[PDB]
């Protein structure tokens, strides 16, 4: 039946039946309720897009890439099984994302369970297992040629990396003669996945930013080529221009959107409300076990029901135990947001870790501003946001000469105050410039 | 002093402080949680847009058009007061929509409370009143030049209509101001200019209308001694493209066969939960999905979230409704039986919607069947809609500027039993019904 979907970025998108059986599941439809840019919608009206449309776009591009490669280089032995496998992986890369996307894995779980190590990617593999175990997708895979064991491995390894983790070949879903396949959906080495292609295009389409690259061109002029004796997705030397444009694009999206002063403040605000509500909201999981926002990631049956909905559940609650949290959201509505204090950077290659996120506010309040301050602030009154951004650009990308196509030719720390009196704002700036100095961080300007 | 927002459609929208005060309220922010195409999102994966962005765009377009009209025609005498009122009309236009937009007032309320007469436009007037009274906006309006009495009247009339010049908000010499946010005559208002563009941009359809061009070559001319907004002859081309865009959107999106079934499925889950869903209102009064339209304190909290409340619900009372929605996830949707029209007959009325399923199941298919379906098994979807329009438009010529120059009802039937035998029985019942109701013969 090959269902066709009309997407705003990719136009008509043909979907194989296995891809549909997966999409039409509770586990997968969950992304229809998780905004892609998270809190960015409270700054960009156009950012109403959710992770569902993204996951579809990534599946469509991942397949376009493998199929084009296999058609131009039959030697590579790219099979239709491989095509379908890469498609499913790109279709589930974000299946593990939580409410408001990055807010959840980058700031919420870190401040809620600092001892835990959670990643949207780990979550993706776990939800994939849940999806294929709760919707009997295993037999459907066999029916369409896939080899369940081997192929499920291949897909998960495409989403999270060598599972079993100067040596040899670490993957176990596919051999080394097909290494290039592991570079389509997620590849931070060259920093060019098909995921980034879709998210750049779509976040640009909806946010209002101009997209300068043309994924279609790459897909056409792409070719597997030998680099340091390894099969790698290379591209013609003429695409350098397009690549630079793509990097420009990436930079613009980060500066104007992903690192937006207010959008990030609204993120820390929502996170605060969640933390204040974490001891009261109940997400029912397996066997009725009542998980919490922070603990729901331990039972995929509940993480299925953990979406952006929680936000409104909080806003519309009557439970007095959720007043604190609810009022934070009410603040957002009225636009009585946290007040920006300053911005600093770690020194050297130091990078603050998630396990130490909860400590940052306290260190700020425990500082001793030289000039004695009238008002004394406490941590609870402080918010410390750590913004991560992921090296010369085109030098790390591989290229091939058209005559011989087979061969080849970071952290921002922002401090915001929950109090708005001119007084407390001045005191926060003092505590902040101190924390920077006594932790050896750049001089706030 | 201002407040620039960045929209993918209009670009850099500048927002006057009064507008920003109206926007930053729980009442206006509730529109960030009501999808525009409602059921469409389940068919068009990029139709995730909500009414909030639409509202901002209508506000912007309204100001763009009035301010320009006045700049070129000072004779008309348009004040910043008029612009701020028209702007507010644009913003609050949709304040009254309900869960999954047009589904709420066009099918759910009519099927749960046939006796009631609720329109989203009425609810917009109610929520606008609630907004300005709950967030002390009246003194702010006075601070920026408005006359709360008259001006709120002008805004409310601009949304719902009159209440021989039938308006108390503004006099007749300013009648053109009432054709910006909603002109039911020429089908040209900024609410359409926006929703066309934005919907096209999220659906994957192309929009060939350059609203900027109209706003440019647009002036106010007289017609039958009535000041109206007319376009330049050089815009006919543009207007034609507009009229195809509309049709395209209607044929391809608004009237989509599955998007429509999915909507009637949503309404079926809401109807199976109304009695069990509580919405705290004024004074703690608990309201139901179908009664929150009576108290705006409750209505303010009635958004699409209700969809996810039922889905994540554990109350066994809600199980039935949960299953309906679970089908939408699993894509085990209602099946399309057929379509018809009431040509040369009386049009179907909302108060009768509820009654329809039983009529269909009461039909006596001429050839007896092996399967007997029940009224609970049918779903009757009445699709209403609002000629050669380019003629209904008014036009002017540069030389002498001052001077001038689709079906109505679609009844569709879906079946819940999806086996062959049942769908066949359904087609028989439906054909019979169409016949003994003198409705067009099902194709
Ligand atoms: Fe992604
Ligand atoms: Fe509208």
Short mmCIF file of C-alpha atoms in Angstrom, two decimals, chain B residues 135-377:
data_model
loop_
_atom_site.label_atom_id
_atom_site.label_comp_id
_atom_site.label_asym_id
_atom_site.label_seq_id
_atom_site.Cartn_x
_atom_site.Cartn_y
_atom_site.Cartn_z
CA UNK B 135 -6.89 41.19 33.94
CA UNK B 136 -7.98 44.77 34.46
CA UNK B 137 -7.49 45.75 30.84
CA UNK B 138 -10.14 48.51 30.83
CA UNK B 139 -7.90 51.13 32.46
CA UNK B 140 -5.11 50.15 30.05
CA UNK B 141 -7.40 50.71 27.07
CA UNK B 142 -8.15 54.14 28.51
CA UNK B 143 -4.43 54.81 28.90
CA UNK B 144 -3.82 54.28 25.16
CA UNK B 145 -6.76 56.35 23.91
CA UNK B 146 -9.67 53.93 23.81
CA UNK B 147 -13.18 54.54 25.21
CA UNK B 148 -13.86 51.12 26.84
CA UNK B 149 -17.59 51.48 26.43
CA UNK B 150 -17.85 52.27 22.72
CA UNK B 151 -14.58 50.53 21.76
CA UNK B 152 -15.38 47.25 23.44
CA UNK B 153 -18.73 47.47 21.61
CA UNK B 154 -16.92 48.02 18.30
CA UNK B 155 -14.62 45.04 18.92
CA UNK B 156 -17.47 42.75 19.95
CA UNK B 157 -19.54 43.72 16.89
CA UNK B 158 -16.49 43.18 14.66
CA UNK B 159 -16.42 39.58 15.88
CA UNK B 160 -20.01 38.48 16.29
CA UNK B 161 -21.88 40.90 14.03
CA UNK B 162 -24.60 43.46 14.67
CA UNK B 163 -26.51 43.33 17.97
CA UNK B 164 -30.96 51.08 9.27
CA UNK B 165 -27.28 51.17 10.30
CA UNK B 166 -27.19 48.24 12.81
CA UNK B 167 -23.96 48.97 14.67
CA UNK B 168 -23.57 50.84 17.93
CA UNK B 169 -19.76 50.50 18.10
CA UNK B 170 -18.87 52.87 15.25
CA UNK B 171 -20.99 55.01 12.89
CA UNK B 172 -21.87 54.15 9.27
CA UNK B 173 -19.27 56.52 7.77
CA UNK B 174 -16.67 54.04 9.15
CA UNK B 175 -18.42 50.91 7.91
CA UNK B 176 -15.34 49.74 5.98
CA UNK B 177 -13.71 49.03 9.37
CA UNK B 178 -16.18 46.20 9.88
CA UNK B 179 -15.02 44.38 6.73
CA UNK B 180 -11.40 43.78 7.84
CA UNK B 181 -11.57 41.03 10.45
CA UNK B 182 -14.60 39.29 8.94
CA UNK B 183 -16.46 40.18 5.71
CA UNK B 184 -19.21 37.61 5.11
CA UNK B 185 -20.04 39.36 1.79
CA UNK B 186 -16.97 39.17 -0.49
CA UNK B 187 -15.26 36.48 1.56
CA UNK B 188 -12.18 38.69 1.93
CA UNK B 189 -11.03 39.42 5.48
CA UNK B 190 -7.59 39.18 7.09
CA UNK B 191 -8.66 36.13 9.07
CA UNK B 192 -8.69 34.30 5.77
CA UNK B 193 -5.48 35.94 4.49
CA UNK B 194 -3.69 34.54 7.48
CA UNK B 195 -5.24 31.13 7.94
CA UNK B 196 -4.82 30.49 4.19
CA UNK B 197 -1.08 31.27 4.25
CA UNK B 198 -0.33 29.57 7.58
CA UNK B 199 -2.39 26.50 6.75
CA UNK B 200 -0.74 26.21 3.35
CA UNK B 201 2.66 26.55 5.01
CA UNK B 202 2.03 23.71 7.41
CA UNK B 203 0.13 21.41 5.08
CA UNK B 204 2.50 21.29 2.14
CA UNK B 205 0.21 23.28 -0.21
CA UNK B 206 1.10 26.41 -2.14
CA UNK B 207 -0.52 29.81 -1.64
CA UNK B 208 -0.47 32.12 -4.68
CA UNK B 209 -2.07 35.17 -3.03
CA UNK B 210 0.25 38.07 -2.12
CA UNK B 211 -1.68 39.68 0.74
CA UNK B 212 0.92 42.43 0.71
CA UNK B 213 -0.13 43.29 -2.86
CA UNK B 214 -3.78 43.60 -1.90
CA UNK B 215 -3.02 45.75 1.14
CA UNK B 216 -1.07 47.94 -1.29
CA UNK B 217 -3.50 48.34 -4.22
CA UNK B 218 -6.46 48.38 -1.82
CA UNK B 219 -8.63 51.45 -1.28
CA UNK B 220 -12.10 52.26 0.04
CA UNK B 221 -14.67 53.03 -2.65
CA UNK B 222 -18.43 53.59 -2.67
CA UNK B 223 -20.89 50.89 -3.75
CA UNK B 224 -24.70 51.44 -3.62
CA UNK B 225 -23.99 54.33 -1.19
CA UNK B 226 -22.02 52.08 1.16
CA UNK B 227 -18.30 52.64 1.81
CA UNK B 228 -16.56 49.33 1.09
CA UNK B 229 -13.03 48.03 0.62
CA UNK B 230 -12.24 47.47 -3.05
CA UNK B 231 -9.12 46.40 -4.99
CA UNK B 232 -7.34 47.66 -8.11
CA UNK B 233 -8.19 46.07 -11.46
CA UNK B 234 -4.55 44.93 -11.67
CA UNK B 235 -5.27 42.66 -8.68
CA UNK B 236 -7.87 40.49 -10.40
CA UNK B 237 -5.06 38.05 -11.22
CA UNK B 238 -4.14 37.88 -7.56
CA UNK B 239 -7.74 37.49 -6.40
CA UNK B 240 -8.26 34.54 -8.75
CA UNK B 241 -5.24 32.78 -7.24
CA UNK B 242 -6.72 33.46 -3.83
CA UNK B 243 -10.01 31.81 -4.78
CA UNK B 244 -8.18 28.68 -6.01
CA UNK B 245 -6.09 28.50 -2.84
CA UNK B 246 -9.27 28.42 -0.76
CA UNK B 247 -10.74 25.67 -2.88
CA UNK B 248 -7.51 23.67 -2.75
CA UNK B 249 -7.37 23.96 1.04
CA UNK B 250 -11.02 22.98 1.32
CA UNK B 251 -10.85 20.07 -1.11
CA UNK B 252 -7.51 18.80 0.13
CA UNK B 253 -7.49 19.69 3.83
CA UNK B 254 -10.66 20.99 5.45
CA UNK B 255 -12.85 18.37 3.68
CA UNK B 256 -10.32 15.48 3.81
CA UNK B 257 -12.11 12.16 4.09
CA UNK B 258 -9.99 10.69 6.87
CA UNK B 259 -9.36 13.93 8.73
CA UNK B 260 -13.11 14.22 8.95
CA UNK B 261 -13.57 10.64 10.15
CA UNK B 262 -10.84 11.12 12.75
CA UNK B 263 -12.69 14.21 13.96
CA UNK B 264 -15.99 12.35 14.34
CA UNK B 265 -13.94 9.76 16.26
CA UNK B 266 -12.66 12.42 18.64
CA UNK B 267 -16.20 13.72 19.14
CA UNK B 268 -17.27 10.13 19.81
CA UNK B 269 -14.69 9.84 22.61
CA UNK B 270 -15.67 13.23 24.11
CA UNK B 271 -19.33 12.26 24.05
CA UNK B 272 -18.40 9.06 25.89
CA UNK B 273 -16.61 11.03 28.60
CA UNK B 274 -18.66 14.24 29.04
CA UNK B 275 -20.64 12.78 31.92
CA UNK B 276 -17.40 11.77 33.61
CA UNK B 277 -14.98 14.68 32.99
CA UNK B 278 -14.97 17.50 35.55
CA UNK B 279 -13.78 21.04 34.76
CA UNK B 280 -13.53 23.25 37.82
CA UNK B 281 -15.18 26.57 37.23
CA UNK B 282 -16.36 29.68 38.96
CA UNK B 283 -16.75 29.02 42.66
CA UNK B 284 -15.57 25.45 42.44
CA UNK B 285 -18.60 24.57 40.35
CA UNK B 286 -17.67 21.42 38.48
CA UNK B 287 -18.52 21.57 34.79
CA UNK B 288 -18.42 18.94 32.04
CA UNK B 289 -16.83 19.12 28.61
CA UNK B 290 -20.20 20.01 27.12
CA UNK B 291 -21.14 22.60 29.82
CA UNK B 292 -17.88 24.55 30.15
CA UNK B 293 -19.17 26.75 27.36
CA UNK B 294 -21.47 28.30 29.98
CA UNK B 295 -18.74 29.45 32.41
CA UNK B 296 -15.60 30.99 30.93
CA UNK B 297 -13.56 30.29 34.05
CA UNK B 298 -13.96 26.64 33.24
CA UNK B 299 -13.88 27.06 29.44
CA UNK B 300 -10.49 28.78 29.77
CA UNK B 301 -9.16 25.40 30.94
CA UNK B 302 -10.92 23.43 28.13
CA UNK B 303 -8.31 22.84 25.42
CA UNK B 304 -7.04 19.92 23.37
CA UNK B 305 -5.42 18.62 26.57
CA UNK B 306 -8.74 16.88 27.16
CA UNK B 307 -7.72 14.48 24.40
CA UNK B 308 -4.66 13.45 26.42
CA UNK B 309 -6.63 13.39 29.65
CA UNK B 310 -8.91 10.67 28.36
CA UNK B 311 -5.98 8.84 26.76
CA UNK B 312 -3.92 8.72 29.93
CA UNK B 313 -7.00 8.14 32.12
CA UNK B 314 -7.33 5.11 34.40
CA UNK B 315 -10.86 5.69 35.64
CA UNK B 316 -12.80 2.67 34.33
CA UNK B 317 -15.71 4.99 33.70
CA UNK B 318 -13.61 6.48 30.90
CA UNK B 319 -12.40 3.14 29.46
CA UNK B 320 -14.89 3.21 26.58
CA UNK B 321 -13.71 6.70 25.52
CA UNK B 322 -10.09 5.64 25.99
CA UNK B 323 -10.58 2.76 23.52
CA UNK B 324 -11.99 5.11 20.88
CA UNK B 325 -8.82 7.21 21.08
CA UNK B 326 -6.64 4.11 21.30
CA UNK B 327 -8.06 3.19 17.88
CA UNK B 328 -6.97 6.54 16.46
CA UNK B 329 -3.44 5.66 17.61
CA UNK B 330 -3.57 2.14 16.24
CA UNK B 331 -5.21 3.53 13.11
CA UNK B 332 -8.28 1.34 13.42
CA UNK B 333 -10.53 4.15 12.21
CA UNK B 334 -14.19 4.32 11.25
CA UNK B 335 -14.84 3.35 7.63
CA UNK B 336 -16.11 5.57 4.83
CA UNK B 337 -19.51 4.37 3.54
CA UNK B 338 -20.54 7.23 1.33
CA UNK B 339 -21.51 10.84 0.74
CA UNK B 340 -24.60 12.75 -0.40
CA UNK B 341 -26.14 16.21 -0.62
CA UNK B 342 -29.55 17.68 0.16
CA UNK B 343 -30.09 19.36 -3.20
CA UNK B 344 -33.54 20.88 -3.68
CA UNK B 345 -34.34 19.79 -0.14
CA UNK B 346 -34.25 21.40 3.27
CA UNK B 347 -30.77 21.52 4.73
CA UNK B 348 -29.92 19.39 7.76
CA UNK B 349 -29.91 21.35 11.05
CA UNK B 350 -27.61 20.82 14.02
CA UNK B 351 -30.55 20.11 16.35
CA UNK B 352 -31.25 17.14 14.12
CA UNK B 353 -27.68 15.80 13.89
CA UNK B 354 -28.10 13.47 16.87
CA UNK B 355 -31.20 11.95 15.32
CA UNK B 356 -29.55 11.04 12.03
CA UNK B 357 -27.71 7.79 12.92
CA UNK B 358 -31.00 6.14 13.94
CA UNK B 359 -32.65 7.29 10.69
CA UNK B 360 -29.93 5.52 8.71
CA UNK B 361 -30.29 2.35 10.76
CA UNK B 362 -34.08 2.53 10.40
CA UNK B 363 -33.93 2.34 6.62
CA UNK B 364 -35.31 -0.86 5.11
CA UNK B 365 -32.80 -1.85 2.40
CA UNK B 366 -34.94 -3.22 -0.42
CA UNK B 367 -32.82 -6.39 -0.61
CA UNK B 368 -32.72 -7.90 2.86
CA UNK B 369 -29.33 -8.34 4.49
CA UNK B 370 -27.54 -10.99 6.54
CA UNK B 371 -26.08 -8.31 8.80
CA UNK B 372 -28.27 -5.84 10.72
CA UNK B 373 -26.51 -2.70 11.82
CA UNK B 374 -27.66 -0.41 14.64
CA UNK B 375 -27.80 3.36 15.02
CA UNK B 376 -24.80 3.12 17.31
CA UNK B 377 -22.86 1.68 14.34
#
